[PDB]
């Protein structure tokens, strides 16, 4: 972990905004290092992994079917829906919705999936029930991305998010089958290339989900490690900055480059 905290500091100085950071050991669950681990930041799309974890738990309990086909309409389409827009005529199965929501950050897929579970309140109740009393989802896409200053709607804390993600990927919360699927969806993430993946050395494993919002909000949650095997959870959030997206990504990418070097 060592030197990564100056970078987190530097990043805070380059972006002129708050940066929240936490590295957790996947196996033990012990915190390795942190910075503002207990301040709230907008989750943005990083919530979609929590969403599909909830969907997968329902599958496990016979409440939902990955192969169930959901038929939606034009009224349901929202900003940033590359996969759902293409399958509008034929619909999509619950499995295809999570794949789109996580790997392509499809917003309509997330809204559809939220509807299958009862909405943002039920995802929050799900989280609350598994010991996370910090993370909260209040709105659907695209509003949840507003990142209004001081607004606690649709927020989490780096620490709460890292622990919740760890419980979903390694607990008994989900079956090995569901854990394989959720991690594989994150492994197959196709939209987070500019962040942690840009500093990831060859042979390294990473399963992640990124998020972007207004007010320069940018974030990412990941399980990564050397030798193609994940060994640590990393959660990074930033909001408030005025720098370009490329600069915001660059800083997050540099944080990652540092935590990798001092692994």
């Amino acid at each position: 972990h060592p030197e990564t905290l100056v970078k987190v500091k530097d990043a805070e100085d380059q972006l002129g905004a708050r940066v929240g950071y936490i590295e957790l050991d996947l196996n033990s669950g012990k915190i390795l290092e942190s910075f503002r681990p207990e301040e709230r930041f907008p989750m943005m799309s990083t919530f979609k992994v929590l969403l599909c974890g909830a969907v997968l738990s329902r599958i496990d309990a016979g409440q939902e079917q990955l192969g169930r086909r959901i038929h939606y309409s034009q009224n349901d389409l929202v900003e940033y829906s590359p996969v759902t827009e293409k399958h509008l005529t034929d619909g999509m199965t619950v499995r295809e919705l999570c794949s789109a929501a996580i790997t392509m950050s499809d917003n309509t897929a997330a809204n559809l999936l939220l509807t299958t579970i009862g909405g943002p309140k039920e995802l929050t109740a799900f989280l609350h029930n598994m010991g996370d009393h910090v993370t909260r989802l209040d709105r659907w896409e695209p509003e949840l991305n507003e990142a209004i200053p001081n607004d606690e709607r649709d927020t989490t804390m780096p620490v709460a998010m890292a622990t919740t993600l760890r419980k979903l990927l390694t607990g008994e919360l989900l079956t090995l089958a569901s854990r394989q699927q959720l991690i594989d969806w994150m492994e197959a993430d196709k939209v987070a290339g500019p962040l942690l993946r840009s500093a990831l050395p060859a042979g390294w494993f990473i399963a992640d989900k990124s998020g972007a919002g207004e007010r320069g909000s940018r974030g990412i949650i990941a399980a990564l490690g050397p030798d193609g095997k994940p060994s640590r959870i990393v959660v990074i959030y930033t909001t408030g900055s005025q720098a370009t997206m490329d600069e915001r990504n660059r800083q997050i990418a540099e944080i990652g480059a540092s935590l990798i070097k001092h692994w």
């Binding site: 799309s45 034009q74 389409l77 900003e79 940033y80 293409k86 794949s99 939209v191 490329d246």
Partner: protein
């Protein structure tokens, strides 16, 4: 050459082959299979948590199929965005495309999606529009005032808006 763009989107026409689409869009920017079926998906610049993009649908999975569907987000910018919540409120189900455009503004919308199920006939054509107010459009971020208007055979079927004033 470059990533997918609005110019490239406008150049690709219904009736074109797969190869014509690739040649125009730049194969390096496109993909097929996976979550896009036999459609061709081409990426533009980074935007929000994804990117501007276009998706082209074909009459069939045949190698000689023709474009019958064009969709895109954030490649096209509205020409003169004059939509407001009040005008959106006047938009009524059953209006013709001509009437809707007269209400929201001739340059307030871009084509989100257009599909000809009976290509080349226009019978059953579905039209999905993305319309914006003055500062609403964003090709690299999040909209700040927009609406979704959709038709079938040139007749409005529904409408929805987000953050318009």
């Amino acid at each position: 050459a470059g990533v997918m763009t609005g110019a490239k989107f406008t150049q690709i026409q219904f009736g074109m082959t797969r190869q014509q689409v690739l040649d125009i869009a730049g194969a390096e920017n496109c993909e097929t299979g996976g979550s896009f079926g036999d459609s061709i998906h081409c990426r533009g610049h980074a935007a929000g948590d994804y990117a501007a993009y276009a998706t082209f649908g074909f009459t069939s999975a045949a190698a000689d199929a023709k474009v019958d569907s064009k969709s895109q987000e954030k490649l096209l910018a509205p020409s003169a965005p004059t939509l407001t919540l009040a005008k959106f409120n006047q938009v009524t189900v059953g209006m013709t495309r001509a009437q809707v455009l007269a209400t929201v503004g001739q340059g307030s919308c871009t084509t989100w999606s257009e599909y000809y199920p009976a290509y080349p006939s226009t019978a059953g054509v579905t039209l999905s529009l993305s319309c914006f107010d003055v500062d609403g459009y964003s090709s690299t971020g999040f909209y700040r005032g927009s609406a979704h208007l959709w038709f079938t055979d040139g007749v409005l079927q529904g409408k929805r808006q987000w953050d318009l004033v």
